Amino acid sequence: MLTDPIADMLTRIRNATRVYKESTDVPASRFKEEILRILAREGFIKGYERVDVDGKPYLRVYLKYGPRRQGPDPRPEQVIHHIRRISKPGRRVYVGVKEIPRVRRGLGIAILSTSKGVLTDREARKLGVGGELICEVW
Amino acid sequence: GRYIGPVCRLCRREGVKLYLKGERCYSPKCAMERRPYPPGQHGQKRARRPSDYAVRLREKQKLRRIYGISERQFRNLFEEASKKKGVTGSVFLGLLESRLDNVVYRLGFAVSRRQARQLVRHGHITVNGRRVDLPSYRVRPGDEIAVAEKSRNLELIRQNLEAMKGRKVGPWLSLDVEGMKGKFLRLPDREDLALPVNEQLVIEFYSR
Amino acid sequence: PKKVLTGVVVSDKMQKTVTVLVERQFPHPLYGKVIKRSKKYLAHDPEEKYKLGDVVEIIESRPISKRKRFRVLRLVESGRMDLVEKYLIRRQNYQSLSK
Amino acid sequence: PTINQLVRKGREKVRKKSKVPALKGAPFRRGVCTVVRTVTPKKPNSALRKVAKVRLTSGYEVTAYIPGEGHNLQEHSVVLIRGGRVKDLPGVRYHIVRGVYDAAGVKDRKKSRSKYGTKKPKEA
Amino acid sequence: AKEKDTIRTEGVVTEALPNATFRVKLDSGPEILAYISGKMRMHYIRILPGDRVVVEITPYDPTRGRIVYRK
Amino acid sequence: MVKIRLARFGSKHNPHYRIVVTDARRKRDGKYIEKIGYYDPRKTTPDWLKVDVERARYWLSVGAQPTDTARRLLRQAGVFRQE
RNA sequence: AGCUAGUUGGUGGGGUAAUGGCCCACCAAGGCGACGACGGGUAGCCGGUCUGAGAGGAUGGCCGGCCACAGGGGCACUGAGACACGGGCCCCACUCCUACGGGAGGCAGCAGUUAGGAAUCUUCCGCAAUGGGCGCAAGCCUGACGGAGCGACGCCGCUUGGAGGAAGAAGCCCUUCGGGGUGUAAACUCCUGAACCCGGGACGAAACCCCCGACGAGGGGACUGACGGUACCGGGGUAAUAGCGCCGGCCAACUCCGUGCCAGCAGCCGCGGUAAUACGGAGGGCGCGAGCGUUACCCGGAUUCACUGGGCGUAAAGGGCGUGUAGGCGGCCUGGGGCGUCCCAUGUGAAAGACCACGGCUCAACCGUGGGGGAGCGUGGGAUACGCUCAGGCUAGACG
Ligand SMILES: [Mg+2]
Ligand SMILES: [Mg+2]
Ligand SMILES: [Mg+2]
Ligand SMILES: [Mg+2]
Ligand SMILES: [Mg+2]
Ligand SMILES: [Mg+2]
Ligand SMILES: [Mg+2]
Ligand SMILES: [Mg+2]
Ligand SMILES: [Mg+2]
Ligand SMILES: [Mg+2]
Ligand SMILES: [Mg+2]
Ligand SMILES: [Mg+2]
Ligand SMILES: [Mg+2]
Ligand SMILES: [Mg+2]
Ligand SMILES: [Mg+2]
Ligand SMILES: [Mg+2]
Ligand SMILES: [Mg+2]
Ligand SMILES: [Mg+2]
Ligand SMILES: [Mg+2]
Ligand SMILES: [Mg+2]
Ligand SMILES: [Mg+2]
Ligand SMILES: [Mg+2]
Ligand SMILES: [Mg+2]
Ligand SMILES: [Mg+2]
Ligand SMILES: [Mg+2]
Ligand SMILES: [Mg+2]
Ligand SMILES: [Mg+2]
Ligand SMILES: [Mg+2]
Ligand SMILES: [Mg+2]
Ligand SMILES: [Mg+2]
Ligand SMILES: [Mg+2]
Ligand SMILES: [Mg+2]
Ligand SMILES: [Mg+2]
Ligand SMILES: [Mg+2]
Ligand SMILES: [Mg+2]
Ligand SMILES: [Mg+2]
Ligand SMILES: [Mg+2]
Ligand SMILES: [Mg+2]
Ligand SMILES: [Mg+2]
Ligand SMILES: [Mg+2]
Ligand SMILES: [Mg+2]
Ligand SMILES: [Mg+2]
Ligand SMILES: [Mg+2]
Ligand SMILES: [Mg+2]
Ligand SMILES: [Mg+2]
Ligand SMILES: [Mg+2]
Ligand SMILES: [Mg+2]
Ligand SMILES: [Mg+2]
Ligand SMILES: [Mg+2]
Ligand SMILES: [Mg+2]
Ligand SMILES: [Mg+2]
Ligand SMILES: [Mg+2]
Ligand SMILES: [Mg+2]
Ligand SMILES: [Mg+2]
Ligand SMILES: [Mg+2]
Ligand SMILES: [Mg+2]
Ligand SMILES: [Mg+2]
Ligand SMILES: [Mg+2]
Ligand SMILES: [Mg+2]
Ligand SMILES: [Mg+2]
Ligand SMILES: [Mg+2]
Ligand SMILES: [Mg+2]
Ligand SMILES: [Mg+2]
Ligand SMILES: [Mg+2]
Ligand SMILES: [Mg+2]
Ligand SMILES: [Mg+2]
Ligand SMILES: [Mg+2]
Ligand SMILES: [Mg+2]
Ligand SMILES: [Mg+2]
Ligand SMILES: [Mg+2]
Ligand SMILES: [Mg+2]
Ligand SMILES: [Mg+2]
Ligand SMILES: [Mg+2]
Ligand SMILES: [Mg+2]
Ligand SMILES: [Mg+2]
Ligand SMILES: [Mg+2]
Ligand SMILES: [Mg+2]
Ligand SMILES: [Mg+2]
Ligand SMILES: [Mg+2]
Ligand SMILES: [Zn+2]
16 A cells, blocks of 8 residues: 555655656646646646546656756756655644744745645745645655 | 053054054154064064964954954943844944944044043043943944033143044044034944945854 | 633543543643644543543543542543553553662 | 653763862862872873872872972972863873962962962062 | 972882883882882883882872882 | 832932832832822922822732821822811 | 552541541442552752754753752641751760769751861951841841852953064074074064052942821932942053963974983884984974863764664574564555644743843953744644544455
């Protein structure tokens, strides 16, 4: 059994983005989906769409990368330089509104699960709610 | 008790002209003239490249010695600026500039820093109609620093203000010469002070 | 407010009394993982109404005896011995790990 | 280690042992000499190091080093221990105070006089 | 200051103890521990266990001595 | 007996009293029930006595007793005036 | 690693202000423990304090709040209240009186003594102020308190002079013997005037009391100093304590002589075995200054017990393997509940401290006023993504 499907999803993408894969597939889940919405909304991925692979529903996640660079190692600068799961099973992380962090001095994001929905660190801070600090992304 | 002794021997150790002698730091006798090397046996010897700690240590000493203050007052004065809101650098300077004895010299009352220190110490300075004899008195903006009417007839006082006729005073300052008055208009800014010191070095000296 | 807790009966062997086990969820004060702590309460059953395994509510009460300050309020869930099974076996494991 | 583990067993603070059992944790401790000796050093150095077995008020018999060029500490003379170890002498974990009950300061000491317990001379 | 209570009494080596150590038996009285002087060791100079040697003794401990004269 | 008195919060040669409600059985510098004013005997500030009379009048209605000095300052603030 | 006999529970009784195995009887056979029972060690606890970027580590002196003890142990009486420091009864050890029969004691109250100890004060003034006991009051008691004394113990303010003054005295130190250094530093010119002398000389004080009014409101009137002739103001007035550590690097400051693995320095790495910037002195220099160095101890550096924020192929570290118990962890869909979680309200978070502001001692330390914060816990209300839960549905995991 897969333990932490979100962490697997983030790691699917973390592995996907380092070999510069066009797309990778992750098992479909409404929470996973509500996560990818923030990512496509925030411009970290090109986007996503549902897909059935051998009859099983997935999420085609299309990654994005910067410009091809100059001499040795012309491999483009990453768009998602960092992704880290935070509120893991067996060590759960919850923040209040005041306990919301400032990722990368504001240049990053922090995806929050709140009773009002899945939100970015800015989104919940202007909403004035807290919850499960799921992950840093930047 | 502050430092008492040879003054123009520390004009050379810092490498920059320090006018704590008052006069004779301007006439060709300062010992900064034709003698800019540090004192002692090994002054004229070639000096090695100072360490990073050496650079900040001297910058603090170059500033502390200018005002004539012991390190104990000097250090605690600095710690105040860090707690107070604003840039720690220029905040500290205005605090030194707000010392009563410094204001006496700044207003051109005294020849030197040490002279202003003794002028205040012997109670000759009036602040808003009240005599004050503490050189470490913090002058507020608007305070009236005047000369005691008892001492307005002292020939040393009329001596200095005779050379003050026509001399300009600090932008944050203003004095009445015939009445021997003077007012602390504002805390001086960084650009108000012509001090040959880099504040950031001294601040970095205290991060350790 | 008199404090009120919900637990399970784990001992019926006494007279006019029943032992009640109450779980508590709370995050760790440094490691922040949610941790499960339990506490046994001696509850008063004046009519021997409640039986082993019944899920009951308890209330802060005027002391009955040494080690008795809670009265049984009402039945929440009737007779779930799966919770009893967990309690007894943890007690029974202690028969090893002695010598 | 796992968070579950750290919950179950947790860290163990590191207990620091006192390098100076001058008991009661006292800054100093007075005692009487038992011997006054000269001990040879460890490998890198060679000299005759004046030390003294001392019987202390705490109830300890430990070695104490005698600083300075020359001393008057005798078999039964009373002294006060400072602490601090002589690097090149094994087992000598404490120093000796010059300027104390039966221990006099170094004569004609002119550079470091706070150390070695000597007064201030006069210049005519 | 270099106190001048040192002596230059003579003796005979007895034992060949480890690390430049001997049991030099003074002609005057008893034997001491008698480690070798540094000048001698820098100049090497092997000392057999039956040599006549000169000993430097500080009165602060007559139990110890220093072999100054090589043979 | 609940009593209304002064507690010395000043420094040496600079007294400063906190007019206070406390039980007489407590230390004069002990914990009190309610701070109901301050007194400066040296008169070194223009405002050297504040009372909040309508709060002081409450504690009297339940049985608090002032000291002869405490009664002096309350009357000075017109706690007792009834016109 | 197992503990428990009033031990756990019951009925009834005794008791107390009052619940209660608090005690008694009788009945039942229980209660606790790996979520750390029992046993051993240590320890008053907090408000806070110290440190630290912080999470945290440490501590609990003074001050404030609670607990406990009053030479040790036990006991009760009186009382609203004690099982009572300066009340009582008894056992024990001790000091003292003793007519040997028997008695009196209790500073962990203020000072003071002795012991130990590295070490910690005056056998002070005073009831003027605030507070407390009694009293109609007058007033009485108060080693609570307010002051003074001693101690650089801490903090803080202040002095040992300012200006003029030689391309530069004497002395010391170094030298390429030309000179360089101590250095405007001394002398000395001129000005000021710490101490000290003289007079004036406080606030802290206003009530209780008296009188008018009805012993009220209100008004009016009178006494009242320890500190102390102190603080402060006015006047006179003399150039008038500087010490301590360091100078091989970390770490800022260098030369000469002495000494030759010696004498010694040393926090660490290390110097010295004939030129030593490391040892000892001198000159010079660096650092602080009525202080300056050392040891002990705490924190930091230490990310070196790693929640923030470490690791286990070879550096310290995968259990020799399996099964499996407890525990921890949990795939996709839907729904109820809302325990965790989040939000708002509210009560609370004493004062002091800490933080911002203003103000009072000529500044400061200190002190006053006002402001704001704060986790946590109580309560009421709301949200349901996630975690939990109950119900159903699935087939990607697991099994067949
Ligand atoms: Mg601030
Ligand atoms: Mg600042
Ligand atoms: Mg201006
Ligand atoms: Mg820091
Ligand atoms: Mg039963
Ligand atoms: Mg009962
Ligand atoms: Mg068992
Ligand atoms: Mg262990
Ligand atoms: Mg009290
Ligand atoms: Mg009135
Ligand atoms: Mg019985
Ligand atoms: Mg009963
Ligand atoms: Mg439990
Ligand atoms: Mg349990
Ligand atoms: Mg104890
Ligand atoms: Mg840290
Ligand atoms: Mg801090
Ligand atoms: Mg403690
Ligand atoms: Mg503690
Ligand atoms: Mg005390
Ligand atoms: Mg007792
Ligand atoms: Mg007793
Ligand atoms: Mg009574
Ligand atoms: Mg008692
Ligand atoms: Mg008693
Ligand atoms: Mg009593
Ligand atoms: Mg007593
Ligand atoms: Mg007797
Ligand atoms: Mg003694
Ligand atoms: Mg005292
Ligand atoms: Mg008296
Ligand atoms: Mg009184
Ligand atoms: Mg009197
Ligand atoms: Mg009184
Ligand atoms: Mg009365
Ligand atoms: Mg009396
Ligand atoms: Mg006192
Ligand atoms: Mg001069
Ligand atoms: Mg003259
Ligand atoms: Mg004169
Ligand atoms: Mg005077
Ligand atoms: Mg008065
Ligand atoms: Mg008055
Ligand atoms: Mg009448
Ligand atoms: Mg009146
Ligand atoms: Mg008087
Ligand atoms: Mg002079
Ligand atoms: Mg340093
Ligand atoms: Mg250096
Ligand atoms: Mg020698
Ligand atoms: Mg040294
Ligand atoms: Mg050598
Ligand atoms: Mg030589
Ligand atoms: Mg030499
Ligand atoms: Mg040297
Ligand atoms: Mg050195
Ligand atoms: Mg030296
Ligand atoms: Mg010198
Ligand atoms: Mg000072
Ligand atoms: Mg000190
Ligand atoms: Mg630091
Ligand atoms: Mg440490
Ligand atoms: Mg740490
Ligand atoms: Mg370690
Ligand atoms: Mg970790
Ligand atoms: Mg490691
Ligand atoms: Mg290994
Ligand atoms: Mg293996
Ligand atoms: Mg799940
Ligand atoms: Mg579960
Ligand atoms: Mg809820
Ligand atoms: Mg709140
Ligand atoms: Mg507060
Ligand atoms: Mg002020
Ligand atoms: Mg609530
Ligand atoms: Mg709902
Ligand atoms: Mg739901
Ligand atoms: Mg199901
Ligand atoms: Mg099927
Ligand atoms: Zn000059």
